[PDB]
Every structure is written in C-alpha cells, then in structure tokens.
Amino acid sequence: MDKFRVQGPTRLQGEVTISGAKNAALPILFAALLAEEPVEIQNVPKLKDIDTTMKLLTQLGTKVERXGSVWIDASNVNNFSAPYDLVKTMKASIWALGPLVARFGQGQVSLPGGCAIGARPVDLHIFGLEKLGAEIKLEEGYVKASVNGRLKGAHIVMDKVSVGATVTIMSAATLAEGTTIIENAAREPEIVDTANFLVALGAKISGQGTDRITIEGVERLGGGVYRVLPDRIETGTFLVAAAISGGKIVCRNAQPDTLDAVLAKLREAGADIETGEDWISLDMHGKRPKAVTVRTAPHPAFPTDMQAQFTLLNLVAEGTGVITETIFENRFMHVPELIRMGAHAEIESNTVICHGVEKLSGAQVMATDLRASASLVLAGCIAEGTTVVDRIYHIDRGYERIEDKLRALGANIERVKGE
C-alpha cells in the first residue's frame, strides 16, 4: 500500500501549476454525453476518476481518448447503461443518468454497495430528473431513467443545495424542451464550469454561480473545446502548504475568484496574497501563520475541502483558532493524526479548537479523506523528522502528482511502496 515518507521541516516555496479540477472535469465529462459533435476537454487532470469515466463513456458508445485533454466523441453513444463493473469505484457515475435520459430518452446507472442514490427521502438527482419529465426506477441494483419524447423544462426547487444533482439537472435541462429554472442551485465553481462547458456546446444557461440556474433547452448540443477550470482545492492546498511553512508560492494556472473565502482566510492567517488573472501568490515572509477562525459553508463560503488544510494551518499557527464544520460535522480524522504529530486540538461537536504549536513532529499517520491525507503530507513537510503518510493512494486519486508538486516546492518526500 503506497505511503508518503516525508522528511521535515522544509519550507514549501516556489511555483506550482494547478491542475484542472477533477470536480469540474467529471461532470463536464458526463455532460459531454450531450454533445453530438467532438469535444475536447482541456486541462483534465490525470486521475483515476477520469480514467474510470473514460472507460464508462466508452462503454456507452463514446469514442474517448486522453493525453492534457480528454477527447470525447459522443456522437455515436448507443449503450444507455453504466454497468456495475464500470461504476463500482465511482459515485460520479450517476452523472451519466441525466445526459443519457436527456439526449436518449433513457439511461441507467448501476448502484454498487455504499451507493446512496435513492436512499434520501428526496434524492435530488431523481427529483430533478422526475421534474424534467423522466420516470425514475430503482430496480435490479440500478437507477433507471426514462422519458417519453423529450424532457420538459421545469421550475425545480432543490430542497438542499446539491452540486451533484445540480449538475444532473442542469445538464439534462440543456436538451429539455423549454426553460428549466433550478432554485437553490449549487454555486460551486465546478457548477459554473460545467454550465460554461454546456454553453460551449450550444446550451443556454444563465445564473451559474448563483442560487438560480436557468436553462433554456436546445434541441441538440454540438461539440467544442473547453478548458476545465483550475482545482481550487489543490490551489488552496498549495497556498496552505506555503502559509504553514513560511514560504512564498505562486500558483500557476489558478483562478483566484474560485477562492475568495480561502484567500481571505489566508490573509487573516497573515499571508501576503496577490492575485493575477491566472495566478495566486502567497507569501508568509517567513512568518508563522496567525490562528484563524474557519467555518465551512456552501460555496462561495469557506470550502469544507479546505478544512483539514486549514486545521493544519491553525495547528501550527500562533494562537488558538477554531475550525468549524457546518458541512461535514465530523470531518476531523486528520485531527487525531495531527495530534500524533504534536498538534494540540480538541474536537468539540462540529469544531476543532486548535492550539497552534511551533513545530510538528514526524509520526506515522493516515487519513482516508483525501484532504486530510494531503494535509498530513503537508504536516510531514513542516514537521520535525520523518512522517509516514499511509494510504496515499487517496491523495493520488484527487491530486495529480502532489509528490512532484511538493518536491518542486522543496519538500523531501518519497513514495514508499508497501513498507
């Protein structure tokens, strides 16, 4: 089982090129199921999920290939079924649903173990599709979707903000007859990205980024070239990497505007931040971060995906800072790990009271959450001694060559195979 053996402390500084957001690449990849013409999705990170999606797309009759881009030709999609073996490791698979039913009047996606599709009293995906006119069936380990003719625009009010379902409904509504208005729409930069992708295909979408998305269905989507937006969480991870190490870092291929809350938080922590059109610079001026108050909340508020990183920040910051989760109330597995590294924290309800210490200590740590895991690698970078982060395949899944990235930042990191 791969592990990251990090030797600290090392100042993390220099430059990093931010990869495209898997979180945007994914829905865009599925959205490409709508395209009748070739589509080139640029800036797609090389991550397992992308491969799994490619494999899934191909299974559907999609002609797929990749490098920095993923080339998609969904012109001939003929199979409307995402099979078990193809979706088993990837929840994102539900994304094949809306496009399939929207474009082909039918679609189905396997529901492997752990798959909570349809488990909610109101499954947003199902709900939105249903609102669009699709008949949703939960049968034979499958979520099945069918619509006689085309989907119909609908005024859809999402009972909860759902990135996943927002993508599904927005995507599907692009081919629906009429106007679809999604209320309480997820505001994630990834939603905006997917919508913009769609628009590039000829879809009519407005409001992306706001709580209200309005899609004017079109008969067909063509193709085009679309560049996946920068990974805001990777960016944030890198910014934090410098913030917690007295470093100066320039994030290339970044999109500052997806990170308002995070950058503001960083300034609070004492970071000297500058931003350009495609870059973010973070300079600690060799300074230890100042403890900050963090409260995760739906985008554009502080992202829970940055939560562990900021916990780490607080953990080596000056002063006591509180990390509060309003999204994943128990998303604190990194804490006991960090405590083994000398961090001082109390997990109280949905919060972590962080007592910043000057220096962490290497330890053998493991967090299954990718952010927590990356946070641990970061901690190892700044910790005294050797830190072994176990199960880093988690990181591998959500970060494109974080090892290479960190190394280029000055980290003493080594991928250790097995033991």
DSSP string, 128-196: HHHHTTPEEEEETTEEEEE-SSS-B--EEE-SS--HHHHHHHHHHHTTSBSEEEEET----HHHHHHHH
Selected from 1.25.10.10, 3.40.50.300, 3.40.630.30, 3.65.10.10, the CATH number assigned to the domain covering 1-18+230-418 reads 3.65.10.10
Please tell me what resolution, in angstroms, this structure has.
Answer: 2.0
Question: Measured at the alpha carbon of residue 74, what is the angle toward residues 73 and 77, in degrees to the nearest 5?
Answer: 135
Domain topology for 21-228: UDP-n-acetylglucosamine1-carboxyvinyl-transferase; Chain (3.65.10)
- The three-point CA angle 103-104-108 to 5° equals 110
| C-alpha span between 362 and 100 (Å, rounded) | 49
Which spans in 300-385 are helix H?
307-315, 334-340, 370-382
- Out of 115, 251, 354, 381, the active site residue is 115
- Is 354 noted as a catalytic residue in this protein? no
Experimental method for this entry? X-ray
Q: Report how far apart the first and last C-alpha atoms of the chain are (Å, whole number).
A: 7
Which residues of the chain does CATH 3.65.10.10 include? 1-18+230-418, 21-228
Whether 255 contacts 232, CB under 8 Å: yes
Give yes or no for a contact between 190 and 163, defined as CB atoms under 8 angstroms apart: yes
CA separation for the pair 226, 69 (Å, rounded)? 9
Q: Reduced to 3 states, what is the DSSP secondary structure of residue 307?
A: helix
**Secondary structure of residue 278 in the 3-state scheme:** coil
Q: How far, in whole angstroms, is CA 94 from its chain's centroid? A: 16
DSSP percent split of the chain into helix, strand, coil, nearest 5: 35, 30, 40
- Round to whole Å and give the CA distance between 305 and 331: 10
Read off the tokens for 314: 């607080």
